[PDB]
Write a protein that binds this ligand. Sequence first.
Ligand SMILES: CC(=O)N[C@@H]1[C@@H](O[C@@H]2O[C@H](C(=O)O)[C@@H](O[C@@H]3O[C@H](CO)[C@@H](O)[C@H](O[C@@H]4O[C@H](C(=O)O)[C@@H](O[C@@H]5O[C@H](CO)[C@@H](O)[C@H](O[C@@H]6O[C@H](C(=O)O)[C@@H](O[C@@H]7O[C@H](CO)[C@@H](O)[C@H](O)[C@H]7NC(C)=O)[C@H](O)[C@H]6O)[C@H]5NC(C)=O)[C@H](O)[C@H]4O)[C@H]3NC(C)=O)[C@H](O)[C@H]2O)[C@H](O)[C@@H](CO)O[C@H]1O
Length: 149
Amino acid sequence: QIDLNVTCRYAGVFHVEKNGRYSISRTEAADLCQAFNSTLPTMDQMKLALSKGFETCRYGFIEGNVVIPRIHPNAICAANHTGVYILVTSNTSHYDTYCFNASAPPEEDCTSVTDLPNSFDGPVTITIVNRDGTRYSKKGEYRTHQEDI
Ligand SMILES: CC(=O)N[C@@H]1[C@@H](O[C@@H]2O[C@H](C(=O)O)[C@@H](O[C@@H]3O[C@H](CO)[C@@H](O)[C@H](O[C@@H]4O[C@H](C(=O)O)[C@@H](O[C@@H]5O[C@H](CO)[C@@H](O)[C@H](O[C@@H]6O[C@H](C(=O)O)[C@@H](O[C@@H]7O[C@H](CO)[C@@H](O)[C@H](O)[C@H]7NC(C)=O)[C@H](O)[C@H]6O)[C@H]5NC(C)=O)[C@H](O)[C@H]4O)[C@H]3NC(C)=O)[C@H](O)[C@H]2O)[C@H](O)[C@@H](CO)O[C@H]1O
């Protein structure tokens, strides 16, 4: 079983956390976004999302970097920084991910995610968990690198 907690989309950008813990490698992140018919966001896509209301208190991959979007300063979320905070120094390699779906609405979309449209055949029960608790499950796989499995 894999549980994927997903946020609202902001100009197509959303956050995904796997199994309630920082647990996604950079290769898994890319695979996960693809399974959502999405891509790792660019910095510019993130910046537009943050301008529309997107913030989290989680490190996650984008294309090229690990970031936290911050609107309000909070001392335990990117050490009180605002903006798209870029992680500079870390020993470790596993984070959450962000994803970008170009077909999402242009502003804030807090409707539930109901589908992992490009997951492939496989043995895993994958459950999408929305913040309101609504869940969607399917049997499949999305990880293409053996080292991530
Ligand atoms: C120093 C040093 O060594 N080097 C410097 C470096 O320091 C490092 O910085 C890191 C950093 O990023 O800051 C540090 O990492 C953090 O360490 C902490 C201690 O170990 C960790 O706790 C923290 O983990 C994160 O904790 C968060 C937390 O809040 O505990 C977690 O986020 C929460 O997740 C919850 C579940 O998803 C969310 O529900 C919650 O959101 C809040 O939820 C509220 C609620 O629902 O109750 C909600 O309140 C409601 O809001 C509505 C509408 O707004 C109101 O109307 C309603 O009434 C409210 N209800 C009420 C009143 O109850 C809130 O709005 C909402 O925020 C999440 N919390 C937040 C804040 O969003 C998160 O999941 C954990 O990951 C670590 N942080 C991270 C990011 O991992 C590290 O320890 C440091 O070493 C510096 O960063 C660097 C700077 O350059 O410099 C180095 O030198």
